[PDB]
Amino acid sequence: SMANINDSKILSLQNRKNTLVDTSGYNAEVSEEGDVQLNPIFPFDFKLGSSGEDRGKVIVTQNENIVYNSMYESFSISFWIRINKWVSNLPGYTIIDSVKNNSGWSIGIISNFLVFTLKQNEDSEQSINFSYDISNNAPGYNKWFFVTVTNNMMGNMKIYINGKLIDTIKVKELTGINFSKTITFEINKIPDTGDSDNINMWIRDFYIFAKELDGKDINILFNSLQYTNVVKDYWGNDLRYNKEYYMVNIDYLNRYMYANSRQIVFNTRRNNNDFNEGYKIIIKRIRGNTNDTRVRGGDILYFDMTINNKAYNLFMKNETMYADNHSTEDIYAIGLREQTKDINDNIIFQIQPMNNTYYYASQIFKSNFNGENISGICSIGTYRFRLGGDWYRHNYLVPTVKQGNYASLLESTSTHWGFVPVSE
Ligand SMILES: CC(=O)N[C@H]1[C@H]([C@H](O)[C@H](O)CO)O[C@@](O)(C(=O)O)C[C@@H]1O
Ligand SMILES: CC(=O)N[C@H]1[C@H]([C@H](O)[C@H](O)CO)O[C@](O)(C(=O)O)C[C@@H]1O
């Protein structure tokens, strides 16, 4: 139902033909100053940085009449945004500003909050915010998310994140508020809080609507702006074949991947503020869309890991498993085996996207070559092994495949796997 949603669209800031333009039909003027990077590939975002006098600035100047006839009753503002590195102690930055003469609206970030503000005058404002979960984001909330703010002078001001309502407040009397026709994208530090690291901000598809969109329409909009079958890396960018990742289990983000006697094991991270420990995997395609190197749901694939200059495949072992109390029926360890000339069945997996409001992840199923026989799901658990010279069995946290009726595990977060791109 996009046709009806789009009827009220009054600004549609998009990258078309390597140029930022308003495609809504109201012909807002758009200019760039400083360092503004345009992405030539989907999602065609623009990137701004915070440091230097030559930092990027994107200025949108709307038709003043469309503003006047739209903003004073009800409106919605939507856009995709990414911040790196959005650490929990971030100082204050205004990032998207529509304030002139001490009135208008503005969006800023501080600590773990993204804040939307109606500014009535120099002495009066009303704000709402999204705050990310710090305990689950020590490396920073550096992922793409979809913001939608809605306002109704006769009702509430709301902010949604990835299509989910996060904050709502009754709008107070804002008599005399004056909406500016100008919107300025630029990362501007607030000086009285009262030299930090540069941050980057990426933006794409910044829309404004002259109606208050409801939750249902916000989600339709959310989904219309993504390829939901393209699996995403941990920051929400397209997952790629032939590229190094840190593979993580959503239930164990504080663990990195290691290996011991060809058994993969999970060790506690020493650097909680980064993803920079342990071994990396590379995803290899068996079956998928050969037009690019993007990973899609339903693709058949396998995983490589290189240790001490030897390249292995992850594979489902065929040995009995032992656990302190749990039964281990149909549970098999995932370990590492030397590559061979031909793809062996026990290295073959099938991937599916598994996203939610706070994580981009996947589920990974044990598969045969043509995907006609899906026999299990990848999980994680603590089992008894003798590794690395051990005489006695010890407990290790290891990746596993659960076969038999794996359906019972489908809703478990233990089956959710993320892929963090390696910076170096
Ligand atoms: C020894 C060997 O032939 N290795 C080849 C492997 C194996 O065929 C598969 O990993 C199955 O083990 O496939 C590659 O595409 C890879 O994964 O990098 C190229 C590599 O040269
Ligand atoms: C493939 C594999 O498991 N390699 C592991 C090896 C083997 O355990 C060892 O060569 C045979 O026992 O030992 C390490 O180098 C080590 O403990 O320092 C870690 C490495 O990840």
Swiss-Prot record:
A motif (Host ganglioside-binding motif) lies at residues 389-391. It comes from Clostridium botulinum C phage (Clostridium botulinum C bacteriophage). This is Botulinum neurotoxin C heavy chain. A ganglioside GD1a (d18:1(4E)) binds at Y252, I380, G381, T382, Y383, S414. It comes from the Viruses. A ganglioside GD1b (d18:1(4E)) binds at A259, N260, S261, R262, Y279. Changing W391A: Receptor-binding domain (RBD) has greatly reduced binding of ganglioside GD1b, no longer binds neurons. Residues 402-416 are annotated as: Ganglioside-binding loop. The chain holds residues 867 to 1291 of 1291 of the full protein. Residues 4-226 are annotated as: N-terminus of receptor binding domain (N-RBD). Has 3 functional domains; the translocation domain (TD) and the receptor-binding domain (RBD) which is further subdivided into N- and C-terminal domains (N-RBD and C-RBD). The N-terminus of the TD wraps an extended belt around the perimeter of the LC, protecting Zn(2+) in the active site and may be a pseudosubstrate inhibitor which serves as an intramolecular chaperone for the LC prior to its translocation into the host cytosol. The RBD binds transiently exposed coreceptors on the host presynaptic cell membrane. Binds phosphoinositides, which might play a role in membrane-binding. It is found in: Secreted. Residues 227-424 are annotated as: C-terminus of receptor binding domain (C-RBD). Responsible for host epithelial cell transcytosis, host nerve cell targeting and translocation of light chain (LC) into eukaryotic host cytosol. Composed of 3 subdomains; the translocation domain (TD), and N-terminus and C-terminus of the receptor-binding domain (RBD). The RBD is responsible for the adherence of the toxin to the eukaryotic target cell surface. It simultaneously recognizes 2 polysialated gangliosides coreceptors in close proximity on host synaptic vesicles. Changing Y252A: Receptor-binding domain (RBD) no longer binds eukaryotic gangliosides GD1a or GM1a, reduced GT1b binding, GD1b binding unaffected. RBD fragment enters neurons but does not compartmentalize normally; uptake is not stimulated by K(+).
